[PDB]
Design a protein around this ligand. Structure first.
Ligand code: 4XK
Length: 150
């Protein structure tokens, strides 16, 4: 009973989280996930600022209202070579990664590791934060509040 959460650098408080390195988070689970990080789903304005500071990924994730990929550099296999905050328009499916926003984070690029999940609640799951440099932090707990997400 284990979940890996792959997390990125923060840019103006905004970061990306993948569950088990595969698209697998529902919109309701994304909100609970960010809450476990004492974070919220970013607004488009927050995300655009993060992008201006250096934030980009090659993965779809939720923000408040939309599913997006922030892109700085054109890449043919990432958001169809677009730049800016690319908005997913047409999809059959409901499960993606998530973006999260922590207001307490540094204002620009913070590429330090994440070493806590400060607002997870009591639970039976071994939750492991996995940073891009491989550093890991684990704790027993839960963050999902909706039964349909478990
Ligand atoms: N931040 C982080 C920490 C630990 C592992 C990882 C990441 C981000 C990328 N992520 C990629 C996982 C799957 O690669 C995707 C497949 C879909 O297209 C973009 C790359 C791995």
């Amino acid at each position: 009973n284990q979940i890996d959460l792959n997390v990125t650098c923060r840019y103006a408080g905004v970061f990306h989280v993948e569950k088990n390195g595969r698209y697998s988070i529902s919109r309701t689970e994304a909100a609970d996930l960010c809450q476990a990080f004492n974070s919220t789903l970013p607004t488009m304005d927050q995300m655009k600022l993060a992008l201006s500071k250096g934030f980009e990924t090659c993965r779809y994730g939720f923000i408040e209202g939309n599913v997006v990929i922030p892109r700085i550099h054109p890449n043919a296999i990432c958001a169809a070579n677009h730049t800016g905050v690319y908005i997913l328009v047409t999809s059959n499916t409901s499960h993606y990664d998530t973006y999260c926003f922590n207001a307490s984070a540094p204002p620009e690029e913070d590429c330090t590791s994440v070493t806590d999940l400060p607002n997870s609640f009591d639970g039976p799951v071994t939750i492991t934060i996995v940073n891009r440099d491989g550093t890991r932090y684990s704790k027993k707990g839960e963050y999902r509040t909706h039964q349909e997400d478990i």
